[PDB]
Nucleic acid binder design. Structure first.
Ligand SMILES: [Mg+2]
Length: 155
RNA sequence: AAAUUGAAGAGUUUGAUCAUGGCUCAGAUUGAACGCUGGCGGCAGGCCUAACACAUGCAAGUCGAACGGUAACAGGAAGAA
């Protein structure tokens, strides 16, 4: 019922006394389509084995995101080691406007309308981390209402 | 009542990685030029260079209801016609 898709696959190497030892890495994102999204990173000698490992890694380490209506509550800015991510909620019907890694993360999470831009490095492993960081730190008016002790007359 | 409801990335330094950093590409546009090809119509546009030199024709005339006047055409009439 939940959706899963593969971000990128990369071949890595570890040289030994005999020579190189080739390996394959898989970055995947798993989301239920509501705002519960996670990512998994796995390593294996074979591409099917590597992608499978990332699949179970993503089912654990799931997070929850509070969405308004298929979109973000407010503009959000997610920063990881070398990647800067700016996402802001857009109007209905505008669709998803984001880079490769961010679009997959966003679409499996369940955000249909969003304007998202990536600054800094565009390494898939780090932009996915930055995107997850933004969806965390974004908040909901009811949790803010309890946070400030001011009820929900703000909106 | 309606009057911007708007932001995408990729390749390349390494045995492999992250970062930094340049180079390149995917878009739109043009008073365009060239190559290959070419049926029609509508609208628009068309010396960006030598403010270089110019044959030829035209591009500022009009008024007789300002004036003298009759070169020219037509009308009008004295008269050997
Ligand atoms: Mg000129």
């Amino acid at each position: 019922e939940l959706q899963e898709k593969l971000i990128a696959v990369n071949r890595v190497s570890k040289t030994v006394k005999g020579g190189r030892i080739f390996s394959f890495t898989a970055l995947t994102v798993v989301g239920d389509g509501n705002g519960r999204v996670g990512f998994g990173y796995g390593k294996a000698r074979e591409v099917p084995a590597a992608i499978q490992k990332a699949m179970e890694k993503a089912r654990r380490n799931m997070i929850n995101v509070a969405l308004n209506n298929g979109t973000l509550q407010h503009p959000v800015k997610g920063v990881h080691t070398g990647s800067r991510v700016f996402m802001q909620p857009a109007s209905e019907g505008t669709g998803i406007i984001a880079g490769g890694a961010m679009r997959a993360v966003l679409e499996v999470a369940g955000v249909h309308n969003v304007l998202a831009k990536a600054y800094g490095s565009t390494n898939p492993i780090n932009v996915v981390r930055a995107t997850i960081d933004g969806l965390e730190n974004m908040n909901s008016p009811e949790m803010v209402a309890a946070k400030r002790g001011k009820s929900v007359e703000e909106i």
